[PDB]
C-alpha cells in the first residue's frame, strides 16, 4: 500500500513511533504512524491512518530499524515521498 506525499514546510505532516525498541505494537517492531499533523501531506493526500505500519519510505526499508534511523529516512525527503505502508502484520491487523 503506497501513498505518495508531497513533502513541504510541515514535513510529511505526521509523527511516527516504531523501530528497534520503539515498537508501537507489542510484537511488531515496525514503524507506526502514531500521530498525523494538521494540514500535513499525509493528512491531505495521505489517506493515512494512525496505526499504519511503514514498510518503507522512497522504498527504503523501514522494516526493523532504529527509530531515529527510520525518521532520518523520512526526513531526507524533498517535495515528494513514496510512502510504503502495510497494516500491522505481525500483530492484530487493522
Amino acid at each position: 500500500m503506497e501513498i505518495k506525499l508531497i513533502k513541504g514546510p510541515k514535513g510529511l505532516g505526521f509523527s511516527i513511533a516504531g523501530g528497534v525498541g520503539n515498537q508501537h505494537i507489542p510484537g511488531d517492531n515496525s514503524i507506526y504512524v502514531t500521530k498525523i499533523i494538521e494540514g500535513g501531506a499525509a493528512h491531505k493526500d495521505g489517506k493515512l491512518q494512525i496505526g499504519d505500519k511503514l514498510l518503507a519510505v522512497n522504498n527504503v526499508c523501514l522494516e526493523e530499524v532504529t527509530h531515529e534511523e527510520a525518521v532520518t529516512a523520512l526526513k531526507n525527503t524533498s517535495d515528494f515521498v513514496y510512502l510504503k505502508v502495510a497494516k500491522p502484520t505481525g500483530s492484530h491487523h487493522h
Binding site: 511516527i16 513511533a17 525498541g21 500521530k35 527509530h67 531515529e68 525518521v71
Partner: peptide
Amino acid sequence: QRTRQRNETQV
C-alpha cells in the same frame, strides 16, 4: 540521538 525510542516524532 535526536529522534529516539519510547517517543514519537514528526517527520
